[PDB]
Amino acid sequence: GTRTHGLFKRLGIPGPTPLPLLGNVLSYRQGLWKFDTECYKKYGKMWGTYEGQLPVLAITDPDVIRTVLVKECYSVFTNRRSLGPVGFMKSAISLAEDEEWKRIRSLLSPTFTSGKLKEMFPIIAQYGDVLVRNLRREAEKGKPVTLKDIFGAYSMDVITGTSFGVNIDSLNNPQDPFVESTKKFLKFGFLDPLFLSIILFPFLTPVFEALNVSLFPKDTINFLSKSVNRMKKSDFLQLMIDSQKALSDLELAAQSIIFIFAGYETTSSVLSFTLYELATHPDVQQKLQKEIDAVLPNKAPPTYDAVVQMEYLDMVVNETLRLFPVAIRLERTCKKDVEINGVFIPKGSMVVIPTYALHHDPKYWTEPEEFRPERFSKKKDSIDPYIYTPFGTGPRNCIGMRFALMNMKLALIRVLQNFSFKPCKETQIPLKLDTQGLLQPEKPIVLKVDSRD
Numbered sequence: 001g002t003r004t005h006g007l008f009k010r011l012g013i014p015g016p017t018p019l020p021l022l023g024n025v026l027s028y029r030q031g032l033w034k035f036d037t038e039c040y041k042k043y044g045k046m047w048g049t050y051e052g053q054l055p056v057l058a059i060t061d062p063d064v065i066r067t068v069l070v071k072e073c074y075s076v077f078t079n080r081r082s083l084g085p086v087g088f089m090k091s092a093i094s095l096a097e098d099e100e101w102k103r104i105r106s107l108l109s110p111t112f113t114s115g116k117l118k119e120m121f122p123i124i125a126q127y128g129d130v131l132v133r134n135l136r137r138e139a140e141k142g143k144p145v146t147l148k149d150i151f152g153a154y155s156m157d158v159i160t161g162t163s164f165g166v167n168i169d170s171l172n173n174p175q176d177p178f179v180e181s182t183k184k185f186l187k188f189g190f191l192d193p194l195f196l197s198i199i200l201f202p203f204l205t206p207v208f209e210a211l212n213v214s215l216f217p218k219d220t221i222n223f224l225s226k227s228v229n230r231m232k233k234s235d236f237l238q239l240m241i242d243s244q245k246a247l248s249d250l251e252l253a254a255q256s257i258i259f260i261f262a263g264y265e266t267t268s269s270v271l272s273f274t275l276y277e278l279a280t281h282p283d284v285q286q287k288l289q290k291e292i293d294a295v296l297p298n299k300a301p302p303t304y305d306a307v308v309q310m311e312y313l314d315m316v317v318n319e320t321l322r323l324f325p326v327a328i329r330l331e332r333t334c335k336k337d338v339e340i341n342g343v344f345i346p347k348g349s350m351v352v353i354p355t356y357a358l359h360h361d362p363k364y365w366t367e368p369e370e371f372r373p374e375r376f377s378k379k380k381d382s383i384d385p386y387i388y389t390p391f392g393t394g395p396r397n398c399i400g401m402r403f404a405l406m407n408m409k410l411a412l413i414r415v416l417q418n419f420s421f422k423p424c425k426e427t428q429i430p431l432k433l434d435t436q437g438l439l440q441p442e443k444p445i446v447l448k449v450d451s452r453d
């Protein structure tokens with residue numbers, strides 16, 4: 001297993017020497033965020049690695065990133081990582097490819113406009129009541145609060161409510177079938193010999209597909225797919241039903257499932273990261289509460305234009321996503337041979353935009369390890385959209401981005417209206433990141449939560 005391991009050597013592209021069969025995969029064990037940053041430091045603008053035999057080209061030049069993510073998205077860099085064994089979930093928008101992706105993305109676009117988001121605002125804001133009640137019971141407990149329990153439950157509640165209109169109280173119904181099924185999405189493929197064998201030996205994917213082996217939790221997929229069909233007999237779901245070029249009843253089920261998959265852990269982790277930064281920066285937290293109280297005096301309920309016009313809240317969310325871009329990197333496959341900034345790259349190679357590394361780059365951000373929301377003041381020069389990519393850029397960016405920001409802002413408004421967050425002896429400071437999957441802390445974020453009354 002070395003046939004491709006001379007590619008970058010031959011092209012002159014720097015990078016860490018791969019091992020036979022494994023490639024550079026052993027360097028993932030410290031975390032992809034750490035590997036990308038150390039490679040950037042060591043090799044510069046562009047470096048090559050191998051996932052088994054698969055060549056991987058990382059690029060950090062904003063102009064080359066623009067060509068990959070926008071200019072040649074339809075012609076060359078249309079799809080992400082080559083598809084693992086996923087069964088009918090291949091129809092999910094995030095896993096679909098080429099013409100099928102273009103159609104599905106186009107059918108779902110009316111669902112994610114800013115106009116539809118303004119309509120669904122009351123359906124989203126209503127989950128703030130449960131959130132505050134849950135956190136109150138934990139705050140009035142006089143003990144540190146494990147944030148991920150509170151905000152994981154909120155993240156699940158909102159994405160499921162906006163999906164199906166079912167108001168589950170995740171935190172208070174641990175044995176609800178929706179709750180237990182969805183939690184299987186956490187730690188997606190952690191140390192699983194199946195995921196690793198797929199990465200090293202991508203030719204095994206059609207074998208596992210033929211055996212009904214899926215990277216997803218089968219029992220979760222089946223429950224959610226069957227749950228979708230029974231409700232159609234009797235919302236994101238309602239928008240897709242009305243749109244029925246057709247969106248088949250299996251394609252529609254794939255979207256319902258993938259929205260929950262994409263929005264659940266991401267929103268939860270970012271929320272918890274945000275409150276860590278506010279607990280460790282009281283002055284930021286107090287400035288934000290000052291702005292919230294000036295817009296919504298006497299804990300007034302949030303409205304749409306009030307959320308959109310909170311500048312410092314927007315800066316705080318953006319600075320949190322700079323420090324903690326939970327997807328770590330963007331990935332595209334060369335569906336044919338392509339020249340990328342003078343480099344001839346073979347068909348099937350992967351191109352990586354190392355979001356985390358570029359977000360912590362001292363060449364673009366002064367004091368890059370510091371939490372400074374003022375970076376995102378609209379008075380300052382615009383932020384290069386190819387350096388700052390927590391949601392990606394171009395035709396294949398995060399379709400739920402607007403919704404995810406709105407959800408997180410509504411959560412942060414309601415808890416900060418009622419509570420203050422400070423560290424305790426059990427708080428890990430500095431926070432250390434995990435080494436697997438989406439960005440999350442090595443130890444669960446715990447904080448002291450005090451009510452403002």
Ligand code: HEM
Binds near residue numbers: 258
């Ligand atoms: C803070 C929370 C979230 C973060 C950080 C996030 C981040 C991302 C990122 C980085 C991508 C990859 C885009 C690219 O490759 O350029 C992505 C894709 C996607 N996200 Fe999100 N996302 C979040 C919440 C959501 C939510 C709530 C939804 C669903 C409503 C969602 C649905 C998707 C979908 C469907 C894609 C695939 C897009 C496609 O291939 O057409 N995300 N997200």
